[PDB]
Structure formats: structure tokens, C-alpha cells
Design a protein around this ligand. Structure first.
Ligand SMILES: [Cl-]
Ligand SMILES: [Cl-]
Ligand code: NA
Ligand code: NA
Length: 535
């Protein structure tokens, strides 16, 4: 990216908004990296909760991170740290440069330039948010010049100061960006920041800031006030059909209604060194065999915790359950249930699948169904066993509605009408928009504690496998408690000899695994750094 261009090359570019746009798109491109949303930040670093875990019984090979059994030297961790800082460098570079060029732009281009400034600042806020929530104690690298300083000069900032920096960035994007559907300045804003995404992300930032580890409880009110602006704008909503979200994201269909922050992956080929393709629907897909000349395989290493399945099966009419979880795989010839053994007929396999005491071993192999390529992709493209053109939802309006409900309840110490309306909008859509909502709605009469429990659960039903559960458990201060409780619950369910698979419980340590370590390579280069607790 721009980090490899010289001082002279950079001073000769960005002479108008079209040139500036090209550099801005390079900031966005950071997101498609394997170490960003192509794999690590989307899938790999979000496993090991009450809803999902990595495949297998142990911690070998790719299972080391999802089982929390990795050292400070783990390569993937260093790669994400480096990629975030690269994103930040690109954002900083763009901002520094456009500040010096905007004065020369035409009236039309100055307007676009402010939007682009807002987009870069929103991206920078997003990158710092990931850094601060995942690593805890990070460096505010505020200029490209700082990136070239001797690393003995680097110091970690208080998380409160990193949050304030993110907040300033997102507040500017909220002020400057139009809503996606109101925008008559940009020719296209597909998969780019607009006001709804800025407000939505700022809501999530404030909610997290209010939770663990910073615990600035004043931010619940800020989260709620921010979400209110977005909710009351009437500019965004929920797609009528939950399934449409998956159809859309698997087919490169941008719809700004619900999708606020979505990473687009697309290449006609995968024979280059920097093709913007990811692992979505592959590593976290439905298990699928390769068929020569027809289909690439999907490894489908993200497995669903069966106790989550059991809880969700009680709410029969919730249509999201079957749209979210695959109890099947694709063989060379058919869609087949995971529980189907060699002797099973369709009827016997169906009976085993429904009974919690049957075929328990194979039930552990269920996967998400949200990124079922065989089911959703309508077009032919490259055949590859590892990569795809499937997109990644980082932030949907439903998440923001649930955050609004959560934050209102936290701030007001109890749910109000707005909190109920926000959560019930999500429940109604999740039940297929029933004529009578008395069955799907959360009942009146809940108090602070019970509404809190309801909203925390709804997040699993609404957003399962989309990368939020672990960070939610962490900001709620219950990550270790939940891993431990999940281990017990699987043990109660399991009726066979031995134990059910839940390797993450063997290694997850309270006071350690709520953060990733500061990468050892960086510890070794920055003499003023302190490693995170218990790392
Ligand atoms: Cl543009
Ligand atoms: Cl998740
Ligand atoms: Na795509
Ligand atoms: Na048991």
C-alpha cells in the first residue's frame, strides 16, 4: 500500500477527489487481508464460547488459538497487530496528505474530500477499536512520522485515551457523512462508511467502553443516545426476510437497509498474491466436498456447541435457528445429515437428529449455515478449496437495535418502551413477522436483571457465528464463567463414554484470556511495553 511509496511519489498524487478516492480505497483494502476480516478477525479469533468452537477434541495445529492454548509468540496474533497498525498508517497517511491538498480542490471535490476524511477517520476508529478491545494496552500511533520513530520511544496508552481517540474519529464521521440512502455526492457508497455505520459503530464502542475492562458506566447513556439518533432517523431497518441477509452477503449484493459495515470480497480469480478473497463460507462454511471441475471443498472447521442448539430448539417458531445452524453437510452426491451413519435411512437419521440422547458424537460437527455456498451462491466463479467471494458482516442494524435495548436497560436500570420496541423488532423479524406478536415478543414485566439476560441471549440468536460472542462475553465480564459453565452443560448432555469435545475449557484461564497478548516480537522491540495480565 501507500506505506511502500516514497515522499516524492505521494506529493505527486491526490491532486483531485478522484485521486484521493483511489488512496482512500487502499485504506479500505486493509480489511480484506487474511489477518483482518478474510480470516483472523472474522473467524479465527472469535471461537471458544457458549455457541461455537473449533473442530476436533484437542488443541493441535489450527486449534491452538480457538482453544486458548497459544503462546505470546503465536504468529497470527503478531500478524493482526501488524495489519491493524498498517491500516492506521494508511489512514494517517491519507489524512495528512488530503489536509495539504483539499485547499486546491474544486468546490465539488472539497465536499467529496470531507466525506473521504470522514471515511478514513471511521476506518481508523474501527482499527483502534479492534486493537483496544482485543489487546487492551496499545500504542496511539498518531502519525506516519511516529511509525518511523525508534521503538524505544513507544508507550502504551491508557485504554480510556484510546477510546477517546476512537470517539473523536467516529463523532467526526457521524457529523460529516450522509446516510447511505441520502447520498447524492458519492457515485457509489456500496461497502463504504456512511452515517448509519458511523453511528452504529460508535454505539458499540460506547457499550464496550462501559463494560469490562474499562467500565466507564457513563458510556451506557452515550451508547443509548447515539443509537437513538440512528433508530429515530428512519434511514435504516431490518430486511423483511432473515434469509435474505445470507443470500445477499453470499452473492455480493449490497443493500444499505440493514448492512452497515460489510467487508466485500471479490475476485474472478485466485492466482495472484493479493487477490481480495476471503475464507468466509470456507473455513466457517458448511462441510462440503470438492467435485473436480464443479466445486471447491469447504473445510468447515467452525463447529456449533450442541447445548446452544438444544436451548434454541425450545423456541420452535424462531426461523433464525435453521437459517443459522447446519445439521448437514454436502457429499459428492447429496445433502446429508451429520448424524447419518452407514446404516441409516433418511427417516432413521431424522429421528436420531431430533433426539438429544442420540448420535451425540456427530452432532458436535454441526456448522454455521449462514455462509452455505452450495445453498446461496447463484453464480460460477473460481473453484478453490480455501477462498471465496463471500462477504463479511461486521455490523448490521439488528446488532445496533439490540445494543440500544441493552444500553437503555443499563442506563435506566430497567427496560422502557424504546428498549422493548428495539428488541421486539428483532424478535418479530426472527419469527418471520408473525401477524400475532404475543408469541414472539419479549413479555412486559421484565426487570433490569431479566431484561439483561434476555438481551444477552437475543444476541446469540440474532448474531450467532458473526464474530461478536466472545467479545460480548468479555465486555460483560463473564468469558471465563461462560466457558466453565458451557463445559458443565455439555457434560450433563453427554451420555456416552468419555467426554464431549470442549477443548477450550482445558486451557482458558481467568484473568488471562480476556485479552490477547501483546505480540512477543513487539515486546522484544519496545523496551517500555508491559505484557498483558498473566501473559
Ligand atoms: Cl466516491
Ligand atoms: Cl460468534
Ligand atoms: Na463478494
Ligand atoms: Na452426562
Amino acid at each position: 500500500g501507500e506505506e511502500t511509496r516514497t515522499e516524492v511519489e505521494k506529493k505527486n498524487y491526490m491532486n483531485n477527489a478522484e485521486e484521493a478516492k483511489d488512496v482512500l480505497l487502499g485504506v479500505y483494502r486493509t480489511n480484506t487481508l487474511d489477518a483482518m476480516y478474510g480470516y483472523y478477525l472474522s473467524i479465527l479469533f472469535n471461537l471458544g464460547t457458549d455457541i461455537s468452537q473449533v473442530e476436533g477434541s484437542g488443541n493441535e495445529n489450527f486449534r491452538i488459538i480457538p482453544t486458548n492454548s497459544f503462546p505470546t509468540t503465536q504468529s497470527e496474533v503478531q500478524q493482526t497487530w501488524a495489519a491493524l497498525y498498517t491500516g492506521i498508517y494508511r489512514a494517517n497517511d491519507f489524512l495528512e496528505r488530503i489536509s495539504n491538498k483539499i485547499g486546491s480542490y474544486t468546490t465539488t471535490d472539497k465536499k467529496l474530500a470531507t466525506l473521504y476524511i470522514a471515511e478514513a477517520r471511521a476506518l481508523r476508529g474501527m482499527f483502534y477499536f479492534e486493537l483496544v478491545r482485543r489487546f487492551g494496552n496499545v500504542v496511539l500511533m498518531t502519525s506516519t512520522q511516529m511509525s518511523n520513530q525508534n521503538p524505544a520511544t513507544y508507550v502504551q496508552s491508557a485504554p480510556e485515551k484510546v477510546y477517546e481517540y476512537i470517539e473523536d474519529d467516529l463523532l467526526y464521521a457521524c457529523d460529516i457523512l450522509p446516510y447511505a440512502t441520502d447520498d447524492q455526492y458519492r457515485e457509489s457508497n456500496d461497502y463504504r462508511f456512511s452515517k448509519g455505520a458511523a453511528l452504529g459503530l460508535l454505539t458499540k464502542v460506547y457499550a464496550t467502553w462501559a463494560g469490562y475492562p474499562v467500565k466507564d458506566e457513563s458510556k451506557w447513556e452515550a451508547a443509548a443516545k447515539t443509537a437513538r439518533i440512528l433508530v429515530e432517523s428512519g434511514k435504516h431497518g431490518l430486511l423483511k426476510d432473515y434469509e435474505q441477509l445470507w443470500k445477499n452477503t453470499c452473492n455480493g449484493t449490497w443493500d444499505p437497509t440493514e448492512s452497515l459495515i460489510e467487508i466485500s470480497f471479490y475476485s474472478p480469480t485466485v492466482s495472484g498474491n493479493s487477490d481480495p478473497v476471503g475464507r468466509i463460507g470456507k473455513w466457517n462454511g458448511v462441510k462440503t466436498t470438492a467435485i473436480a471441475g464443479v466445486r471447491g471443498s469447504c473445510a468447515a472447521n467452525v463447529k456449533v456447541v450442541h447445548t446452544f442448539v438444544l436451548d434454541w430448539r425450545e423456541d420452535v417458531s424462531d426461523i433464525r435457528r435453521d437459517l443459522s445452524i447446519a445439521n448437514y453437510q454436502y457429499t459428492d452426491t447429496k445433502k446429508s445429515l451429520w448424524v447419518a451413519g452407514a446404516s441409516d435411512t433418511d427417516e432413521s437419521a431424522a429421528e436420531k437428529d431430533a433426539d438429544p440422547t442420540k448420535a451425540q458424537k456427530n452432532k458436535q460437527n454441526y456448522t454455521p449455515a449462514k455462509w452455505d455456498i452450495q445453498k446461496y451462491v447463484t453464480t460460477n466463479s473460481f473453484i478453490n478449496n480455501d477462498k471465496s467471494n463471500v462477504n463479511w458482516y461486521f455490523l448490521r442494524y439488528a446488532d445496533v437495535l439490540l445494543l440500544y435495548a441493552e444500553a437503555l436497560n443499563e442506563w435506566k436500570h430497567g427496560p422502557d418502551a424504546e428498549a422493548y420496541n428495539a428488541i421486539n423488532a428483532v424478535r418479530r423479524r426472527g419469527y418471520g413477522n408473525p401477524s400475532n406478536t404475543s408469541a414472539c415478543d419479549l413479555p412486559q414485566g421484565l426487570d433490569e436483571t431479566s431484561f439483561r439476560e434476555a438481551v444477552r441471549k437475543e444476541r446469540s440468536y440474532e448474531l450467532s457465528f458473526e464474530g461478536h460472542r466472545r467479545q460480548d462475553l468479555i465486555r460483560w465480564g463473564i468469558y471465563y464463567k461462560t466457558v466453565q459453565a458451557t463445559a458443565k452443560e455439555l457434560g450433563y448432555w453427554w451420555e456416552g463414554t468419555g467426554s464431549p469435545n470442549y477443548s477450550v475449557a482445558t486451557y482458558t484461564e481467568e484473568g488471562k484470556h480476556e485479552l490477547f497478548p501483546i505480540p512477543q516480537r513487539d515486546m522484544d522491540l519496545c523496551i517500555q511495553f508491559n505484557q498483558n495480565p498473566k501473559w
